[PDB]
Ligand binder design. Structure first.
Ligand SMILES: Nc1ncnc2c1ncn2[C@@H]1O[C@H](COP(=O)(O)OP(=O)(O)O)[C@@H](O)[C@H]1O
Ligand SMILES: Nc1ncnc2c1ncn2[C@@H]1O[C@H](COP(=O)(O)OP(=O)(O)O)[C@@H](O)[C@H]1O
Ligand SMILES: Nc1ncnc2c1ncn2[C@@H]1O[C@H](COP(=O)(O)OP(=O)(O)O)[C@@H](O)[C@H]1O
Ligand SMILES: [Mg+2]
Ligand SMILES: [Mg+2]
Ligand SMILES: [Mg+2]
Lengths: 536, 344, 192, 518, 155, 48, 71
């Protein structure tokens, strides 16, 4: 030191440095703490977890993306696993709990190789080559279901729906949830069975009632009620009609005023009396343009003054006030209407058409909500969920949201696999077979990747109270005797380890990302040597 | 090296320039290694780690010389004379290589950094990236790359033009078609919405009869700029200034795409991609100033929808869409791609 | 009573220097014509409720009603208008056009008594057609603690008559109902 | 290696499963003594302003008392949903959902049962419990006489658990007639509740009309006969027109006096159009100034100011009229009719009483109490009774109460437990023993036996008599059809469904993570 | 300079207000383009409406903040600044053969370099270095050589 | 003596209980009992 | 660690030579007026309170506490 303070970087004593074997041991144990948390919630026998927010709100979910999102951490290695499950939920939306277990399994097998003197890059080079050998092997085993007609294509959507609905709370209703999740895509989809638009399906939760009241409603569900509720709640169309002629207006009902700040100077009583007549002439003109167009229900973004409450009541025109701008886009899609900027552009061709407009009483008081139904197949499907608890209404949203993420992935052509641990076992023996042919220094790299794939089937046996040794040995001996890859772990214990008889189906695009996200993330973690963490 | 600053911002970098930017060096002599790391990264972009290692070794070998009776200037005479013969030696190492006509040099630049093992893929995009830039220009913005959190880095693909984020949701957006067979892109600096026009707003109206004409005049002036765009057949309209829902809904019935909020750096790539021009007024719009491409399709990437410009016969814009699990993964790939393009 | 001040913001623009002379003449003329119609009905006492925004009575209008010998009282609580309407039988006048003699009350003597450094306005006599007469009592005392308790002692006294008029009949106090009910109950409690 | 930050509490082990079950025990034991007509009220000590609140309802008790345990917040949320949906049974849901965790705690500890197995056991057990109530439901809506009588027996059961159990016989007709006035309307915001302090508790009455706390402004008479009531929502005081960019450009104050006078002419012309209707009474929800009020004196029209918008809808349904603005057209506008309008006084504050109104779709309830705590309790006691009777007009199915409905469901649960076999038989039978706690606590609050008395009710149903029930007055088994103890079928399904779903929540939590408070 | 405000009495003046400002810059910038001026040096912020017509005739735009930076620009080309936006005097126009934009230190720099004929004054020296600390003293080292040239004049 | 600068001397039991704050909830109800007697009747509110 | 607990920082080179020469000159500068038959006198204050007034060289030096080690 020579007697003078030696400071290279500001906040010297605040920041710490980790290097050597101690830096690698801290990174592996950081993933083991996250893995053992996620391994308990993996599989249909898993368990949820309570998430306490700093504001007092609680969240109960088993989803690895939601648990880690609200989780407050310290070590940066555990924070990298947070965005790992976030990467899985944002794109594919399925298998968020599997990418955390598989990534930590790669790190657990890598720690044993580091202690043997293997360079970390040589470990990462072996996982990259072994990842492409597992994907290419499973790609040859799967078959294309696109040859079936639309009648059988709906069955495959019901198969993968019931699988994603498991492992989560309120899993007893999955039979009806699987039916409602597929019908949303049947109504909203392209004629070529490709590139379906997910944004056309909205998730609207409601707190009350019971879960058995959840049903599909095609239309718009708004939180605003009819203005001046002297009008009937349920609106009915005319005897003969083309429709209800729903009107959408982004302009409030007011006398015309300049957008710029203006000054209207009245220099005489005669000029003031003309403003009185000019005032009432506009409210009479605005209500006549709607009646001449045949419209019935008028939707306003900014609302309107109390003057038009009785005016629209005389003509029997329902009206709503203070509708959000985002909801106006949702309204024009369901009724296939066009937003009318002003009364001068109002025409009968821009009016929307829906089957019925009505409101429900829901509970005792609560609030008044408007419901729109469609008379035929449309481009708008709104999910309606009820529950006796605020936590049930919340989790059921993302429970069906992840279920819709599985169905939209099946819209992509010629990608299907069977779940239940049958995919990881098939890809595990293919990597271990190449290790004997290659040998060399990378022979131990394929072994670590093969032992990591078997952790997912062994984790399924832990939550089901089984023997991971006896279950894994049966799956490996079955793939060697016969080429059928459909044998997997059964956590429901209905027998018939064949996945074909149990109908369990998973998207291949979801399972392919699990290997890519786990292998490519461990490649960056193993390269970390000096760890500089500043004090908070 | 994993470095966390006082703001708890995680960054993983092996680059000699990026590591020294994260840490704040208060030592006067230690800041000289930061200048040579940023100077090496600015021009060539590669070797910033080797320069700091080499510069520090020259001081380490001069350490036992300072303890002796060797003067300070006598040591600098050795380094200044040896570097003169070292530069001339590099010219002997190099070869004219006018024969053989990017592929090899781009693979070695990715070394020591992520995706280096993926060089069988990302290098193919690095070759065609700079080739779209003509000689004597070689714009650093047109090679710009956008980062999308989430996904796998192997799912990236090459695009002939710029792709930008919407950043705003329009009420009339879905009513606009997302698939164009022959789109015409029109760059405009005009601001389309109902607002005060230029820098001041005041209105003086004595009579109520003339008060109605003032409102109708404001609607006609805003619609006049909207009609001139439709008469030219522009399918896509881009603007820096905000665009209200009034102009967006008008373009919905005409099947015309509308966009706004786009940054100034992104629209500079649009002019080079489609070969168009910037029009700051709607009265000067002419048919020959509108660009086009082969097709226009809006694809959603990681819960984010982007506008895809591709298929133009001549385009100088290169924009890549990167994916990765960690927020640093998408940063490290572009950090490797940005350094690999400067080599070629 | 004040120069015209509509609730809507107004702007008085003076184009010619000769217009400033007509403005000062019309401002006092607007307040004069209001006071001229009051003298026609022979109304010597004016009561004004508390004012919001602009003041109740302008200082320029004070000279008009003072030379005509008219007493002016302002800053009257709005909740006290109902008591003054039925008490004096005077229909309130909210407009100078609706001001007439039939809407004005009547009083024999109106005098402001000033004693012990305290001023109070009292009205002697009431002549009108009224089916609901009023009453007022002035309370004095050493301090506010005694005066407030003197009023609270009157509330308990006014409630005694209210209970007798509402419910006809009364019993004897001083401990009579407490002992009598206790004895009548003790005889019936043994039989239960 | 600790991945979590500082001051982060987490239990990954037995301490978590213990804290989750015990956390619901303190919540269940708090509302346990409030179940039944013999239950006792609870006292709430406010942390600010020192405002005491005494309520028998479990929804207010759980929401007012701060609870940091997530296992407790689950039972608080299901009570708020039960109050907002059906309007009654918030305590029964909390108690029943807590007893499901009591029977599930011994299966994991003693019987070593898998948590999901207990959850899957309640799935098949709740299916038989809901099907048992369907066959026991009777629809009396075919007769208006039998349906109106059932509305009285339902009100006697709800009002029994509150402080009104003594006078509930007099208040059963008041709550029954109030629902008949709604004519099937489930909205409770149309009925006004005016709480008056003092007098006997049995003096609460229900008038036919609309009782308004507001009074006439100045000179309007108190009592008037044959008055047409009109309602106007908007403006009519110092009208600002509409746009805010209007101003008066005045050259000389001589012209300024004519501009302000024109504003009074606009007020006079608008009131003159009101007199064309021939109404004796006018009502504005916006407050009326002194100038427009004096115009009604020469016209003989009443004036009312400062009416709340939620009272306007209540007032419009009593008079059967129509809210009228834009008075230019008299034809399309409708007015209300009232036989007599008199201003009365209840206590220190005078009130406006209506009588002989044409429409009965809304009414006003007046309550009397010794203390404000009894007034706040009397309003909440009727709010729970009027909510069940409002939902009864929609769904007319009814199920007998008094411990009968809970024991009938347990009869079908024990039958399905034999065919399941496995280890779920302990979980299915645990759901039946959890249904025993609801009639058992009824006897505990009355000082009865929790074993022999429950066994008499259980053995009577298995002999072929489904009408047997528990009588807390005599402490024996009595018939529920004769005593008139019955509740709505929607209330029976809501308690079973909410408790079964809430029990599946905490049983799925192995780990509890607590972030640092903010 | 005082209370700039748009005054519109009737809708007739409002319709021609948008097209009126477009004809003002068009009429002013047309006289500059007719004189053969391919580059314009500005001393403050230029509005977007003015930059539109400059791109129509292919006229470059330069921003010269503060003062001393703009003062030495006219000594290179031999030009005389004038405040008005009208057509400049042909005798006050400068001469620059080429204007180039290339990458030197990673950013776009504009090249005012002159050639053999039509010589210019106040030349600049591009100084390249690895460290910024060396760039500071060499700048003062060059100024020491420039100050030595001043010693060749007065004596 | 009120918390503010006002002081009240009153023999009325309702005024005494109103200006005297009580920390016991059941004893707070005695203040409302005197209010029920004063509002309906107004006499004998200290006896109840 | 701190290594040496005694003056881990060091003053060496010409800085140590100047401090030794300057302090040594200050010792002789105070007694310059103490030389010669016209020499003045110097008074010294000890912590005990005894006053010593003399022109002697040794009596002045030994009663003054010098913090400079080389002086
Ligand atoms: N009913 C089931 N039968 C067999 N396997 C299942 C079943 N449900 C889930 N799995 C398996 O458990 C794994 C995890 O599924 P789950 O936890 O429900 O959602 P995620 O895949 O998002 O973690 C899947 O890979 C799937 O193969
Ligand atoms: N006279 C009675 N005899 C027997 N049981 C009664 C009698 N009155 C009420 N009960 C029972 O007491 C219970 C009271 O429950 P309650 O406290 O209202 O629950 P919650 O507060 O959840 O609504 C009812 O379920 C009813 O069956
Ligand atoms: N002159 C009297 N002699 C004896 N007892 C009296 C006399 N006057 C009143 N009392 C008794 O004293 C009590 C006084 O009660 P009071 O203080 O007036 O109650 P409050 O102040 O609440 O009205 C009464 O109940 C009455 O029976
Ligand atoms: Mg899943
Ligand atoms: Mg490099
Ligand atoms: Mg109840």
């Amino acid at each position: 030191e020579m007697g003078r303070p030696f400071i290279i970087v500001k906040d010297q004593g605040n920041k710490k440095r980790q290097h050597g074997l101690e830096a690698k041991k801290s990174h592996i144990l950081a993933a083991r703490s996250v893995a053992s948390i996620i391994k308990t919630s993996l599989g249909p026998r898993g368990l949820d977890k309570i998430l306490i927010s700093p504001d007092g709100e609680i969240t109960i979910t088993n989803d690895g993306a939601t648990i880690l999102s609200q989780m407050e951490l310290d070590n940066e290695i555990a924070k990298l696993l947070v965005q790992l499950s976030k990467s899985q939920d944002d794109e594919i939306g399925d298998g968020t709990t599997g990418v955390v277990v598989l990534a930590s399994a790669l790190l657990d097998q890598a720690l044993e190789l580091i202690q043997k003197g293997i360079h970390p890059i040589k470990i990462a080079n072996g996982f990259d080559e072994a990842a492409k050998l597992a994907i290419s092997k499973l790609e040859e085993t799967c078959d294309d279901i696109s040859a079936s007609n639309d009648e059988l294509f709906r069955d495959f959507l019901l198969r993968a729906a019931k699988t994603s609905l498991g492992s989560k709370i309120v899993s007893k209703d999955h039979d009806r949830f699987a039916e409602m999740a597929v019908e949303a895509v049947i109504n909203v989809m392209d004629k070529d069975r490709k590139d379906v638009d997910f944004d056309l399906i909205k998730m609207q939760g409601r707190v009350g009632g019971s879960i058995s009241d959840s049903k599909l409603i095609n239309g718009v569900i708004l939180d605003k009620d009819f203005s001046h509720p002297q009008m009937p709640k349920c609106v009915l169309p005319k005897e003969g009609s083309d429709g209800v002629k729903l009107a959408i207006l982004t302009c409030p009902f007011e006398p015309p005023k300049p957008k710029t700040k203006h000054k209207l100077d009245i220099s005489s009583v005669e000029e003031y009396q003309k403003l009185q007549t000019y005032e009432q002439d506009k409210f009479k003109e605005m209500i006549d343009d709607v009646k001449k167009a045949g419209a019935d229900v008028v939707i306003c973004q900014w609302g309107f003054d109390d003057e038009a409450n009785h005016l629209l009541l005389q003509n029997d025109l329902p009206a709503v006030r203070w509708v959000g701008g985002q909801e106006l886009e949702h309204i024009a899609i369901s009724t296939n209407g066009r937003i009318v900027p002003r009364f001068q552009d109002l025409s009968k061709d821009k009016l929307g058409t829906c089957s019925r407009i009505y409101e429900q009483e829901f509970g005792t008081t609560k609030d008044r909500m408007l419901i729109i139904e469609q008379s035929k197949e449309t481009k708008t499907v709104t999910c309606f969920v009820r529950g006796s608890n605020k936590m049930i209404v919340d989790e059921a949203e993302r429970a069906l949201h992840d279920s819709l993420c599985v169905v939209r992935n099946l819209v992509k052509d010629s990608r299907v696999v069977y779940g239940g641990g049958a995919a990881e076992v098939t890809m595990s023996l293919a990597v271990s077979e190449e290790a004997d042919k290659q040998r060399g220094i990378d022979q131990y790299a394929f072994r670590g990747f093969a032992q990591a794939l078997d952790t997912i089937p062994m984790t399924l046996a832990e939550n089901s109270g089984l023997d991971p040794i006896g279950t894994l040995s049966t799956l490996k001996s079955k793939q060697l005797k016969e080429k059928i890859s459909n044998i997997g772990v059964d956590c429901l214990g209905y027998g018939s380890n064949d996945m074909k008889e149990l109908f369990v189906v998973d998207p291949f695009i979801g399972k392919k990302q699990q290997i890519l996200l786990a292998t490519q993330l461990c490649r960056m973690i193993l390269k970390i040597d000096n760890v500089i963490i500043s004090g908070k | 090296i994993l470095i966390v600053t006082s703001n708890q911002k995680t960054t993983i970098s092996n680059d000699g320039a990026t590591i020294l930017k994260l840490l704040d060096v208060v030592h006067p002599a230690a800041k000289t290694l930061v200048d040579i790391s940023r100077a090496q990264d600015a021009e060539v972009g590669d070797g910033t780690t080797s320069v700091t290692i080499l510069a520090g070794e020259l001081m380490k070998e001069a350490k036992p010389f300072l303890e002796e009776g060797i003067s300070s200037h006598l040591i600098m005479k050795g380094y200044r004379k040896a570097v003169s013969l070292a530069v001339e030696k590099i010219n002997e190492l190099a070869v004219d290589i006018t024969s053989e006509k990017l592929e090899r040099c781009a693979r070695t630049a990715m070394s020591s950094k992520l995706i280096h093992n993926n060089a069988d893929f990302f290098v193919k995009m690095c070759v065609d990236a700079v080739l779209s830039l003509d000689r004597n220009d070689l714009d650093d913005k047109l090679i710009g790359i956008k980062k999308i959190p989430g996904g796998a880095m192997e799912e990236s693909l090459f695009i002939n033009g710029v792709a930008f984020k919407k950043t705003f949701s329009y009420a009339g957006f879905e009513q606009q078609p997302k698939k164009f067979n022959n789109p015409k892109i029109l760059s405009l600096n005009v601001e389309l919405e109902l607002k005060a026009e230029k820098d001041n707003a005041e209105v003086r109206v004595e009579h109520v009869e003339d008060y109605q004409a003032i409102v109708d005049a404001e609607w006609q002036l805003i619609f006049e700029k909207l009609r001139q765009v439709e008469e030219t057949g522009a399918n896509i309209v881009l603007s820096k200034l905000p665009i209200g829902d009034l102009a967006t809904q008008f373009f919905a019935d005409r099947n015309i795409f509308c966009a706004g909020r786009v940054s100034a750096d992104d629209m500079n790539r649009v002019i080079q991609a489609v070969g168009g021009s910037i029009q700051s007024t709607t009265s000067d719009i002419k048919p020959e100033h509108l660009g086009t491409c082969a097709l226009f399709e809006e694809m959603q990437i990681g819960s984010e929808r982007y506008n895809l410009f591709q298929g133009c016969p001549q385009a100088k814009t290169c924009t890549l869409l990167l994916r990765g699990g960690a927020e640093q993964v998408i940063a490290e790939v572009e950090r490797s791609l940005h350094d690999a393009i400067m080599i070629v | 009573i004040s120069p015209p001040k509509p609730d809507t913001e107004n702007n008085i623009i003076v184009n010619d220097y000769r217009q400033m002379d007509k403005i000062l003449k019309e401002e006092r003329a607007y307040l004069l014509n209001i006071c001229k119609k009051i003298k026609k009905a022979k109304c010597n006492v004016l009561l004004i409720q508390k004012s919001i925004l602009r003041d109740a009575v302008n200082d320029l209008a004070l000279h008009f009603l003072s030379k005509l010998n008219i007493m002016v009282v302002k800053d009257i609580e709005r909740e006290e208008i109902e008591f003054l309407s039925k008490g004096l039988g005077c229909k309130p006048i909210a407009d100078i056009e609706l001001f007439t003699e039939d809407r004005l009350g009547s009083a024999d003597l109106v005098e402001e008594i000033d004693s012990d450094g305290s001023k109070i306005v009292r009205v002697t006599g009431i002549r009108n057609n009224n089916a609901r007469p009023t009453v007022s009592v002035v309370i004095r005392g050493a301090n506010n603690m005694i005066i407030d308790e003197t009023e609270r002692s009157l509330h308990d006294a006014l409630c005694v008559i209210r209970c007798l008029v509402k419910e006809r009949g009364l019993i004897a106090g001083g401990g009579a109902p407490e002992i009598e009910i206790s004895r009548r109950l003790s005889k019936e409690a043994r039989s239960m | 290696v600790q991945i979590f930050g500082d001051q982060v509490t987490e239990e990954r082990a037995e301490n978590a499963r213990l804290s989750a079950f015990v956390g619901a025990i303190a919540v269940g034991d708090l509302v346990k003594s409030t179940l039944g007509p013999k239950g006792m009220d609870k006292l709430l000590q406010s942390a600010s302003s020192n405002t005491c609140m005494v309520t028998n309802d479990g929804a207010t008790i759980l929401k007012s008392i701060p609870l940091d345990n997530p296992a407790a917040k689950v039972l608080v949320n299901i009570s708020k949903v039960q109050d907002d949906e059906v309007g009654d049974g918030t305590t029964s849901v909390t108690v029943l959902s807590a007893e499901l965790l009591r029977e599930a705690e011994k299966l994991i500890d003693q019987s070593k049962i898998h948590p999901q197995t207990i959850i899957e056991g309640y799935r098949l057990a709740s299916a038989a419990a809901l099907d048992a109530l369907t066959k026991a439901a009777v629809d009396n809506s075919h007769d208006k006489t039998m349906f109106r009588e059932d509305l009285i027996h339902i009100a006697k059961t709800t009002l029994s658990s509150k402080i009104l159990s003594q006078d509930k016989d007099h208040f059963a007709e008041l709550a029954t007639n109030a629902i008949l006035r709604l004519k099937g309307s489930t909205n409770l915001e149309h009925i006004q509740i005016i709480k008056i302090l003092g007098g006997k508790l049995s003096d609460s009455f229900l008038d036919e009309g609309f009782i308004l706390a507001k009074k006439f402004g100045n000179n309007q008479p108190k009592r008037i006969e044959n008055a047409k009531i009109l309602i106007a929502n908007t403006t009519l005081d110092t009208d600002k027109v509409k746009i805010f960019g209007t101003k008066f450009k005045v050259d000389s104050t001589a012209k300024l006096a004519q501009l302000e006078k024109a504003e009074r002419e606009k007020m006079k012309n608008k009131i003159a159009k009101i007199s064309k209707f021939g109404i004796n009474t006018f009502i504005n929800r916006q407050l009326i100034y002194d100038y427009p009020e004096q115009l009604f004196t020469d016209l003989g029209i009443n004036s009312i100011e400062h009416a709340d918008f939620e009272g306007v809808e209540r007032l419009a349904l009593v008079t059967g009229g129509e809210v009228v603005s834009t008075f230019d057209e008299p034809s399309k506008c409708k007015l209300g009719e009232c036989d007599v309008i008199e201003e009365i006084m209840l206590g220190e504050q005078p009130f406006l009483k209506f009588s002989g109104c044409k429409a009965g779709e809304a009414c006003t309830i007046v309550l009397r109490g010794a203390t404000d705590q009894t007034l706040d309790e009397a309003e909440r006691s009727l709010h729970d009774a009027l909510s069940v009777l409002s939902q009864t007009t929609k769904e007319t199915r009814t199920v007998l109460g008094g411990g009968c409905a809970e024991m009938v469901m347990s009869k079908a649960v024990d039958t399905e437990a034999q065919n399941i076999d496995g280890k779920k038989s302990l979980a299915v039978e645990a759901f039946a023993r959890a249904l025993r706690q609801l009639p058992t606590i009824l006897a505990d609050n009355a000082g009865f036996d929790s074993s022999e008395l429950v066994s008499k009710l259980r053995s009577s149903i298995y002999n072929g008599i489904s009408t047997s029930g528990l009588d807390l007055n005599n402490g024996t088994i009595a018939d529920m059809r004769q005593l008139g103890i019955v509740e709505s079928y929607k209330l029976k399904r809501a308690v079973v469904s909410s408790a079964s779903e809430a029990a599946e929540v905490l049983l799925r939590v192995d780990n509890i993570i607590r972030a640092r408070p903010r | 300079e005082t209370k700039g405000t748009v005054l519109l009495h009737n809708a007739q003046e409002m319709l021609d207000f948008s097209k009126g400002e477009e004809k003002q810059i068009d009429a002013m910038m047309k006289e500059i383009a007719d004189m053969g001026v391919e580059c314009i040096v500005a001393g403050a912020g230029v509005g977007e409406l003015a930059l539109h017509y400059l791109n129509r005739y292919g006229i470059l735009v330069l921003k010269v903040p503060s003062k001393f930076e703009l003062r030495r620009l006219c000594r290179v080309c031999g030009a005389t600044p004038l405040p008005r936006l009208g057509a400049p005097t042909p005798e006050e126009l400068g001469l620059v053969e080429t204007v180039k934009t290339m990458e030197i230190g990673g950013d776009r720099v504009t090249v005012f370099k002159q050639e053999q004929g039509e010589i210019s004054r106040t030349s600049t020296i591009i100084l390249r270095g690895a460290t910024q600390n060396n760039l500071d003293d060499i700048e003062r080292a060059i100024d020491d050589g420039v100050a030595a040239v001043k010693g060749l004049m007065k004596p | 003596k009120t918390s503010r600068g006002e002081i009240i001397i009153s023999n009325d039991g309702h005024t005494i209980l109103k200006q005297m704050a009580i920390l016991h909830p059941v004893a707070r109800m005695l203040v409302e009992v005197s209010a029920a007697q004063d509002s309906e009747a107004g006499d004998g509110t200290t006896s109840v | 660690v701190v290594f040496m607990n005694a003056s881990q920082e060091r003053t060496t080179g010409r800085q140590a030579q100047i401090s030794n020469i300057t302090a040594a000159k200050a010792v002789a500068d105070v007694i310059r007026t103490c030389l010669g038959p016209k020499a003045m006198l110097k008074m010294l204050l000890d912590p005990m309170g005894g006053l010593v007034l003399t022109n002697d060289g040794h009596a002045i030096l030994r009663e003054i506490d010098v913090a400079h080690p080389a002086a």
